[PDB]
Design a protein around this ligand. Structure first.
Ligand code: HEM
Ligand code: HEM
Ligand SMILES: Nc1cccc(C[C@@H]2CNC[C@@H]2OCCNCCc2cccc(F)c2)n1
Ligand SMILES: Nc1cccc(C[C@@H]2CNC[C@@H]2OCCNCCc2cccc(F)c2)n1
Ligand SMILES: C[C@H](O)[C@H](O)[C@H]1CNc2nc(N)[nH]c(=O)c2N1
Ligand SMILES: C[C@H](O)[C@H](O)[C@H]1CNc2nc(N)[nH]c(=O)c2N1
Ligand SMILES: [Zn+2]
Lengths: 411, 407
C-alpha cells in the first residue's frame, strides 16, 4: 500500500511506503485519534525475531544481506540467546542502532543531523562512579567549548530488570526548583520533586534561581548515588537583549547543552535504560517553553512590565510581544558567546528538506506534527503546512517511568 | 474503554466516555496516526434516523415515551414508502446545534447553543437562495454586533438535484493571475474567480473585490448574484501606534461564513448549509495576511518597520507577525465589529471542555486545529490533551462542485 502526504503551501505530494515496516502500536484506532496524548524482562520466544529483524536491517544497510557473514551472525546470535537468554551487540551494530533510533524519532525536528552522532560505548561500566566519569567525558566532548557536537553514551543493557542502570535526572544539566512555605517556587518549578530527592539524598542546596542539579546515578540496580558535575564543565550563557539594556538585570542565564537522560533505547530487542544523548538547542525550547510556560520560569509579566506594554487587556497581544523579545534575546546571547543554537525558522526549513530526502531514499519519514511545529509563530514555519504520518519504527527511543516510582530501595 | 485526558499546565485530569458513542472512522489505525492529514439506501437510512431520534428524545427527557415511539414509527413508515423522511422543526434546530457542538476543529463551541437556525427547506431557485443568503448576512452582521446563524436549504434526494453554494465562504476577495507573473488579490480564490468571469462576472480587477455568489438550486447550472454592498461590512486596517500602517491599503470583511460544508442530521444530507459566527483575530492576521500562498505581506510590513531582514534569527518575521495581529484586533475593536483574540478564545474553549466533560462525558477536539497558528504554547489549549473522534450530527467537507457538476 501507498500513503500520500501533501504540503498545502507548495502542493508537493509525497508517497510513503516505509510505514509498512512499522510494528509497534500508536495509541490510535479507527474510532479515536490520540495524536495529542503525551504518553499514549523479555522471553527467548519474542527476542530472536526482534534480533533477526534488526540484523536483517543492519545487513541490508551495508549491502551484505544474505551474505555468509550475515548468516553466520544470525546463527551466532541465535545460539547466544538459547544459551544465555540474551545477546551482545557488536560495536558496529550498536553505532548503527543508536543512529537509527534518532533517525526514527518522529518528535525530533533536528534529524537532518542523524548520521553525525558520536557514540560512546559504556557497556563495560559497573558502578555509579564509573557512570559519573563517562558522563563528565560526554559533557566535555559534546560541549566542545561552545561548538556543540551530538553524542550519546550507552550503558549496559537490561538483564532481568532487577539490575538496571539509570540516570535519575531527566537531563544531564538542569536547574534546581525549591517550593517555598508561602506557595511560591524558587528556580525551575519543573524540577521541585527531583530537587527534593537530591536534598534527601544529602545534596547541600545553595537555594538560588539557577543551581545546577547534581547527578543521581544508579548502576546495576543499586541505590543511586550523588555527584556534582565539575562547574568548569557546565557551559552557561547569560541572557541579554540587542536593543534592550535592562534585559540583563532580569538576571537570566541558561545552560548550552541540552542532554536527555531519562529515555530507553531499544535495539534488536535489547533495552538500554541509561543512554543519555545530547545535541544543541532550538531557541524556542528556552525562550518560549523554559522561560514562558506558566508552570516554568514564567517571565512574561516582568518582561512586559519593563517593556511598558499595555497589560490591561489580552487583546493588546502584550504576551505575544514580550515572547518575541525574549526569544530574540536568547538567540542573540548564544550567538554572541559562540554557543551553537538554531532558530525555529532555520530548524523547520532544514527538517522539510530532510523529510523530502528521506521520502526519496527511504520511502518515508515518520513525524509527529504536534511536536514538530514550534510553540510560537506556528504557521509562518513550513512544517505547519506539512502533512505528516506518524508511526513507530525500531530501533527507537521510548519514554520510561521515573525510577523513584519503581525502585526497590536496598538501604 | 474509559480514557483520560490530562492538562500538563494545571494537572487537571478528565475522563472521557462520550467516545464510546462514536460512530464514523478517524483515518488513524493502530499502526499509523493521520492526525495531521487535512482530508483523511432504505436499509442504510433507518438505523441512522433511529440513532438520531433516540438522542433527540433523550435530550428532551422523553426517552421511551409514547411521543418518542410514535415518531420512530412515523419516520420508519415514511422511509419505507418515500425512501427518505422530513425533520420536524424542533429536530432541525437540535440537529444543527449539535453538528456545531460535535465539530472537533472548532475552538468557538462555548457558543454552540446560541445558534439562530434559518429553515430554507422551502427554497426552489437560485434567486430564492440569494434572498435567503442576503437575509442571513444582514441578520448575522447586525451592524457589527455579530450573531451566529445557519441557513439550511433542501436535503439531498437522488443526488442529481443537490443545492450547493459554490463559494467556499459567502464573502471572499477575488484573485487574478497577471502577465507580470504574480498574483493580484487573494491567491486562494484564483480558480473560482476565473469560473465567475467564465460565467460573465465583470471583475473590477482590484486587490479586494468581494466575489459574487454562485448559487446552484435543485441540481441546475449555477447563477451569479452580487451581494448588496451595503450588506458586506468591511474593516479598514490600521495600527494603534504605527501611523504608516494604513498606507498598506489593507482591509478585511467582518463576517466569516463557511458555505461549502455538508450538514448531516439523522442520515439526511444538507449540502447547502452556509453558517457564520465571528472571527478569531489570528485567522485574518496570521493566515489570510501572512501565509506565503495568501496575501503574504510579511516582507512589506517588515520593511516599513525597518527591521533587520538579513538573517532569520533576528526574528523579523515574528515581530512583524505580532504587530499585524495587533492591528487587526485594534481595527475591528475601533469599528465595533465583534472579534475575539486567541488568548480569550482558547481560555473560553478550556472552560467549554470542562463543562462538556461534566455534563456530557467528553468533548471531541482536534489539537492540530484548536491550537492557534501563532504563540501556541502561551495559550492554554497547547498544554491540553484532547481526544479526537467523530459524532453525528456533523459538518463534513465536500469536494468543490465544479469537479462534480455536469453543465
Ligand atoms: C542536533 C540538534 C538537535 C536539535 C536542534 C533537536 C531538536 C529537537 C527538539 C526541539 C525536540 C522537542 C524538544 C522538546 O519539546 O522537548 C526534540 C525531541 C527529541 N529528539 Fe531531538 N534534536 C537534536 C538532536 C537529537 C539527538 C542527538 C537525539 C538522540 C540521539 C535526539 C532525539 C530526540 C528524541 C528521542 C526526542 C523526543 C523527546 C521526548 O519524547 O521527550 N535529538 N528534538
Ligand atoms: C461564534 C464564533 C466562532 C468562532 C470564534 C469559531 C472559531 C473557529 C476557528 C478558529 C476555526 C478554524 C477555522 C480555520 O482555521 O479555517 C473553526 C472551524 C470550524 N468551525 Fe467554528 N467558530 C465560531 C462559530 C462557528 C459556528 C456558528 C459553526 C457552525 C454552526 C462553526 C463550526 C465550525 C466547523 C464545522 C469548523 C471546521 C471547518 C473546516 O473543517 O474547514 N463554528 N471555528
Ligand atoms: N516523551 C516525553 C513524555 C513526557 C515528557 C517528556 C519531556 C518533556 C517534553 N518537552 C519538555 C520536556 O522535555 C525537555 C527536554 N527536551 C529536549 C529535547 C532535545 C532538544 C535538543 C537536543 C537534544 F538532544 C534533545 N517527554
Ligand atoms: N475541512 C477543510 C478541508 C480543507 C479546507 C478547509 C477550509 C480551509 C481550512 N483553513 C482555512 C480554510 O477555511 C476557511 C476559514 N474557515 C473559517 C472557520 C470559521 C471561523 C469563525 C466562524 C465561522 F463560522 C467559521 N476545510
Ligand atoms: C498535550 C500536548 O500533546 C502537549 O502539550 C505537547 C504539545 N506539543 C509539544 N511539542 C514539543 N516539542 N514539546 C512538548 O512538550 C509538547 N507538548
Ligand atoms: C497540514 C496541517 O494539517 C494543516 O496545515 C493544518 C494545520 N492546522 C490548521 N489549523 C487551522 N485552525 N486551520 C488550518 O487550516 C490548519 N491547517
Ligand atoms: Zn491518530
Amino acid at each position: 500500500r501507498f500513503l500520500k502526504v501533501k504540503n498545502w503551501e507548495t502542493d508537493v505530494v509525497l508517497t510513503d511506503t516505509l510505514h509498512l515496516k512499522s510494528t509497534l502500536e500508536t495509541g490510535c484506532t479507527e474510532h479515536i485519534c490520540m495524536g495529542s496524548i503525551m504518553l499514549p524482562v523479555r522471553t527467548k520466544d519474542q527476542l530472536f525475531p526482534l534480533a533477526k529483524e534488526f540484523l536483517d536491517q543492519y545487513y541490508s544497510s551495508i549491502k551484505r544481506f544474505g551474505s555468509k557473514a550475515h548468516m553466520d551472525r544470525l546463527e551466532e546470535v541465535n545460539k547466544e540467546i538459547e544459551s544465555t537468554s540474551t545477546y551482545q551487540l557488536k560495536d558496529t551494530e550498536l553505532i548503527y542502532g543508536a543512529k537509527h533510533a534518532w533517525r526514527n524519532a518522529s518528535r525530533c525536528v533536528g534529524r537532518i543531523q542523524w548520521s553525525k552522532l558520536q557514540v560512546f560505548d559504556a557497556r563495560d561500566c559497573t558502578t555509579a562512579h564509573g557512570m559519573f566519569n563517562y558522563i563528565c567525558n560526554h559533557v566535555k566532548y559534546a560541549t566542545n567549548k561552545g561548538n556543540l557536537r551530538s553524542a550519546i553514551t550507552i550503558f549496559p543493557q537490561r538483564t532481568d530488570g532487577k539490575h538496571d542502570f539509570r540516570v535519575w535526572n531527566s537531563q544531564l544539566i538542569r536547574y534546581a526548583g525549591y517550593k517555598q512555605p508561602d506557595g511560591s517556587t524558587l528556580g525551575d518549578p519543573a524540577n521541585v520533586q527531583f530537587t527534593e530527592i537530591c536534598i534527601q539524598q544529602g545534596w547541600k542546596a545553595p537555594r538560588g534561581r539557577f543551581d545546577v542539579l547534581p547527578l543521581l546515578l544508579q548502576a546495576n540496580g543499586n541505590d543511586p548515588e550523588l555527584f556534582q558535575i565539575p562547574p568548569e564543565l557546565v557551559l552557561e550563557v547569560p541572557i541579554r537583549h540587542p536593543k534592550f539594556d535592562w534585559f540583563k538585570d532580569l538576571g537570566l542565564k541558561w545552560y548550552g547543552l541540552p542532554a536527555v537522560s531519562n529515555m530507553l533505547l531499544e535495539i534488536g530487542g535489547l533495552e538500554f535504560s541509561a543512554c543519555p544523548f545530547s545535541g544543541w538547542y532550538m531557541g524556542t525550547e528556552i525562550g518560549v517553553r523554559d522561560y514562558c510556560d506558566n508552570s516554568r520560569y514564567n517571565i512574561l509579566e516582568e518582561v512586559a512590565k519593563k517593556m511598558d506594554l499595555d497589560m490591561r487587556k489580552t487583546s493588546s497581544l502584550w504576551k505575544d510581544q514580550a515572547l518575541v523579545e525574549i526569544n530574540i534575546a536568547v538567540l542573540y546571547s548564544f550567538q554572541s558567546d559562540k554557543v551553537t543554537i538554531v532558530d525555529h525558522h532555520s530548524a523547520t526549513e532544514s527538517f522539510i528538506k530532510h523529510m523530502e530526502n528521506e521520502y526519496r531514499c527511504r520511502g518515508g519519514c515518520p513525524a509527529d506534527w504536534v511536536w514538530i511545529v514550534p510553540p510560537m509563530s506556528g504557521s509562518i514555519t513550513p512544517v505547519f503546512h506539512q502533512e505528516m504520518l506518524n508511526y513507530r519504527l525500531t530501533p527507537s527511543f521510548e519514554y520510561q517511568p521515573d525510577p523513584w516510582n519503581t525502585h526497590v530501595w536496598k538501604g
